[PDB]
Write an enzyme that holds these catalytic residues in place. Structure first.
Site, short mmCIF file in Angstrom:
data_model
loop_
_atom_site.label_atom_id
_atom_site.label_comp_id
_atom_site.label_asym_id
_atom_site.label_seq_id
_atom_site.Cartn_x
_atom_site.Cartn_y
_atom_site.Cartn_z
N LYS B 204 0.74 -1.08 -0.30
CA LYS B 204 0.08 -0.15 0.27
C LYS B 204 1.05 1.14 0.32
O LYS B 204 0.73 2.33 -0.91
CB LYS B 204 -1.38 -0.06 1.30
CG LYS B 204 -2.63 0.86 1.14
CD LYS B 204 -2.46 1.73 1.40
CE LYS B 204 -4.25 2.26 0.30
NZ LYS B 204 -3.77 2.55 -1.09
N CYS B 258 0.50 8.34 3.32
CA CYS B 258 1.14 7.63 3.57
C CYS B 258 2.48 7.13 3.06
O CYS B 258 2.23 6.75 1.60
CB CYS B 258 0.38 7.01 4.67
SG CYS B 258 1.04 6.44 6.59
N1 LIG Z 1 -9.67 9.06 2.85
C1 LIG Z 1 -10.05 8.02 2.33
O1 LIG Z 1 -10.52 7.68 1.59
C2 LIG Z 1 -8.20 7.02 2.22
C3 LIG Z 1 -7.25 6.40 1.07
C4 LIG Z 1 -6.82 6.28 1.32
C5 LIG Z 1 -6.62 5.79 2.78
N2 LIG Z 1 -7.28 5.99 3.67
C6 LIG Z 1 -6.78 5.37 5.20
O2 LIG Z 1 -8.01 5.31 6.38
C7 LIG Z 1 -7.35 6.54 7.43
C8 LIG Z 1 -9.03 7.03 6.93
O3 LIG Z 1 -9.68 7.72 6.70
P1 LIG Z 1 -10.91 8.33 6.91
O4 LIG Z 1 -10.79 9.22 4.89
O5 LIG Z 1 -11.84 7.38 7.18
O6 LIG Z 1 -10.89 9.21 7.42
P2 LIG Z 1 -11.90 10.18 8.47
O7 LIG Z 1 -11.35 11.90 8.92
O8 LIG Z 1 -13.02 10.72 7.59
O9 LIG Z 1 -12.39 8.96 10.04
C9 LIG Z 1 -11.85 9.19 10.86
C10 LIG Z 1 -12.89 8.93 11.73
O10 LIG Z 1 -12.26 7.94 12.53
C11 LIG Z 1 -12.26 8.53 14.11
N3 LIG Z 1 -11.79 8.37 15.23
C12 LIG Z 1 -10.17 8.47 14.87
N4 LIG Z 1 -9.30 8.04 16.07
C13 LIG Z 1 -10.34 7.62 16.74
C14 LIG Z 1 -10.11 6.95 17.73
N5 LIG Z 1 -8.86 6.17 18.42
N6 LIG Z 1 -11.35 5.38 18.16
C15 LIG Z 1 -12.57 5.20 17.66
N7 LIG Z 1 -12.56 6.92 16.93
C16 LIG Z 1 -11.65 7.58 15.83
C17 LIG Z 1 -12.87 10.14 13.91
O11 LIG Z 1 -13.69 10.66 14.83
C18 LIG Z 1 -13.56 10.21 12.26
O12 LIG Z 1 -14.34 9.98 12.31
C19 LIG Z 1 -6.68 7.16 6.26
O13 LIG Z 1 -6.21 8.11 7.43
C20 LIG Z 1 -5.73 6.28 5.97
O14 LIG Z 1 -5.07 5.69 6.91
C21 LIG Z 1 -7.99 6.28 3.55
#
Ligand SMILES: NC(=O)c1ccc[n+]([C@@H]2O[C@H](COP(=O)([O-])OP(=O)(O)OC[C@H]3O[C@@H](n4cnc5c(N)ncnc54)[C@H](O)[C@@H]3O)[C@@H](O)[C@H]2O)c1
Ligand SMILES: NC(=O)c1ccc[n+]([C@@H]2O[C@H](COP(=O)([O-])OP(=O)(O)OC[C@H]3O[C@@H](n4cnc5c(N)ncnc54)[C@H](O)[C@@H]3O)[C@@H](O)[C@H]2O)c1
Lengths: 418, 412
Positions: B204, B258
């Protein structure tokens, strides 16, 4: 229609033979009297399959004549070498194109077409060639046509490539594009990709830069993966399943005539900005040393001193060295006093090169595969029976066969020994 | 069957909606009470086309329930964010993943399956997750199953990809692989690519590294091409005609992701690539200054504040970084126009934002920018666009249009 070709090497000679075979009255021009005499005598200067045959008919036809002096033609083609200047930034040496251009200059007549087939740095056609011509009174797109058409060929049937391969017509004016299209249309069955001189120059050098930087990434990943106990090769295959991801393969370095020449033609034009291309070059240049250090590690853990290099060529299934990281490794391994080096290469014929696989592997404590020769794809434990310690370190991941007594190491397994 | 998703954002929320839509009893967990209340009220937290509709039915079914606290489940999915450890390396901050791991730890029972969907640094599963679990008494491949299954989301076709896209199941043991396969098999029509945790993690990151380095090349070429009076975009199109050449597009920088680097840090190419991509906001600002020096006025309208087109995410955005810099510049008057960005300092009307602006700088590839006429830019002081994302496909008459392949023509 009359044509001149300046520089009758691996490019010029086949280009002459192609236009003459197709009924154009061609003059072949070279600085070398040896090459001229050998051609006038009825023998080709470069080693190519069935080229001597096509030359024979062509010289007898009166369609190809070789001189050391050019003459008035309707089209002039510069196919002279472009070395890498000894300097810091390994700048394009356009010095040979410039003297070839000078030799063409007094025979120019309004209506003529000039083609630079040699590899040139960006903005050569505009800032170097264009001025010298325009100064005589000529006007690009009217009195004279300037075209950069970078010609590249694999000795795997050069004439075949000359016909069927896609060509880039990089003309200084839209008129120059049409003039150059007119010229290659005599035999080019392939596509005529229309563009301006600067784009054709930058684009061609970009093709080799994308490649070099992308190999530098795979090589750098191998260094990272081995320290993290991760198989780089398995990782590349996984990530490449993504349609937008095309990670290249690691290797013992980046040799090639073009592959190491070309990215330096870009750097020298704006050195302070080409940090990524420079870094790319440094990483690829460090691979022979990375392999030597790894080889040193392997022989320290085992008893034996002998190591047999498998492959001395830059590419697989070619007898061509001169531009090889595989040779650079051998040379280094030899120089190492605590290391006994044994050659083995079936393609190239040389004195220090062993041709009986069993004597080369005899009492050797490592087989360092450096070239992707088809003969290495299938290898059994029987080939390596003569060895002191049956262990292979393949850098080109050519070995596809299975082993029982032999210990096989890839760029993706090597951390399992160290 | 009970499943728990920790973190309900662009990843967690659609994943919850998918399992619940397939009959699994899902417990969505988030740390934010706003997000919990809005979801409990019956409204989705993230902007997605056919998602509010599929959530409505699912919430009514009793198949999706949202709390701020996890509970005992048969399978736990961590989908929290992974921010970049502030570097020119862009490593993975696993602290949120590690946080989420702690919150589930007391509800673990023998036979459970843990899935880390978040992007993690190589050897995370083995050197960080594995120890913490094994310490409780559990044994990987026997008591519990550790799987890293890194997602890949495409806003718009999110749920569709969740079903048809090929997945990588990266288990710590061959048992963990089978456990993770049992889970995704509920809706994954796509292929289940079997591998170990470290290979799934590293791949990834490599997918992201290939992209970053290849954008760094296109950006570096733009710098070289502009100094040489060569069209970078025309050059890329030419060279890409080769089947084994796939040069990427330039841009206003690269937004936070990342990389295939171990946080402990050599990694010269990845670092160089990062520096080049990190310098694009400054390169664009310097080019903007130059454009404003030749023209009268001070006003410049930034078109796009997001990292990606047709999204509302301003997090680690080079488009935002440009705006911030342009603002800080005293000799420059800044205005931000983004239809997708709901914020106070962001102008809603396109005409008021462009009013008396000497330059319009496009920084995001929003679909609304693809088609633009001279009429949109009538309110401007000097009708001139400097597009960094080459999004404008339409034709102009009174407006002066500049690209990364054209800027050198503004006589500079
Ligand atoms: N944005 C994407 O569609 C995407 C693409 C590639 C990779 N990723 C991976 O997935 C991760 C998450 O992306 P996302 O877009 O879902 O982020 P996001 O900000 O939309 O959602 C993260 C959620 O997790 C919650 N949260 C944070 N810490 C927590 C905890 N310790 N316990 C419970 N809930 C918690 C937050 O309140 C938030 O609602 C990225 O940082 C990356 O690692 C995401
Ligand atoms: N080797 C290839 O097939 C290949 C591949 C990619 C690019 N190129 C480009 O083409 C160039 C030429 O390659 P090559 O393999 O034909 O080189 P070569 O050494 O085989 O031939 C060059 C010929 O030009 C002659 N020559 C040199 N200077 C001259 C001058 N001023 N006037 C007249 N003749 C002159 C030399 O005597 C020699 O015969 C390369 O340097 C590179 O720019 C070649």
């Amino acid at each position: 229609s009359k044509l001149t070709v300046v520089g009758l090497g691996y490019i010029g000679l086949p280009t002459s033979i192609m236009f003459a075979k197709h009924g154009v009255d061609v003059l072949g021009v070279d600085i070398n009297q040896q090459t001229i005499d050998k051609l006038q005598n009825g023998q080709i200067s470069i080693e190519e399959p069935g080229l001597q045959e096509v030359y024979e008919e062509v010289l007898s036809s009166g369609k190809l004549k070789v001189s050391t002096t050019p003459e008035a033609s309707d089209v002039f083609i510069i196919a002279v070498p472009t070395p890498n200047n000894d300097d810091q930034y390994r700048s394009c040496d356009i010095s040979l194109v410039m003297r070839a251009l000078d030799s063409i200059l007094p025979f120019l007549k309004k209506g003529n077409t000039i083609i630079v087939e040699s590899t040139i740095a960006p903005k050569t056609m505009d800032d170097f060639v264009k001025p010298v011509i325009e100064n005589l009174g000529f006007t690009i797109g009217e009195d004279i046509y300037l075209v950069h058409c970078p010609e590249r060929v694999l000795p795997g049937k050069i004439l075949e490539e000359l016909v069927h391969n896609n060509r880039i017509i990089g003309g200084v004016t839209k008129a120059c594009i049409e003039a150059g299209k007119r010229v290659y249309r005599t035999f080019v069955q392939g596509e005529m990709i229309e563009t301006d001189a600067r784009t054709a120059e930058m684009s061609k050098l970009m093709e080799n830069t994308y490649r070099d930087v992308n190999i530098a990434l795979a090589n750098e990943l191998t260094k990272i993966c081995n320290n993290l106990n991760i198989n780089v090769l398995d990782v590349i295959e996984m990530a490449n399943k993504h349609p937008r991801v095309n990670i290249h393969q690691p290797g013992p370095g980046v040799g090639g005539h073009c592959l190491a020449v070309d990215p330096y033609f870009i750097i020298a034009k704006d050195p302070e900005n080409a940090k990524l291309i420079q870094t790319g070059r440094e990483i690829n240049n460090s691979m022979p040393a990375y392999v030597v250090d790894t080889t040193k590690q392997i022989i320290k853990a085992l008893s034996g001193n002998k190591v047999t290099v498998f492959g001395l060529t830059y590419k697989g299934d070619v007898d061509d060295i001169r531009e090889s990281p595989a040779f650079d490794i051998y040379e280094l391994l030899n120089q190492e006093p605590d290391i006994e080096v044994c050659a083995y290469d079936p393609h190239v014929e040389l004195d220090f090169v062993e041709h009986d696989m069993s004597h080369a592997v005899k009492d050797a404590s490592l087989v360092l595969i450096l070239s992707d020769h088809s003969e290495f794809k299938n290898l059994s434990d029987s080939h390596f029976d003569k060895m002191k310690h049956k262990v292979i370190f393949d850098t080109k991941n050519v070995v596809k066969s299975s082993f029982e007594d032999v210990l096989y190491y890839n760029y993706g397994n090597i951390f399992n020994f160290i």
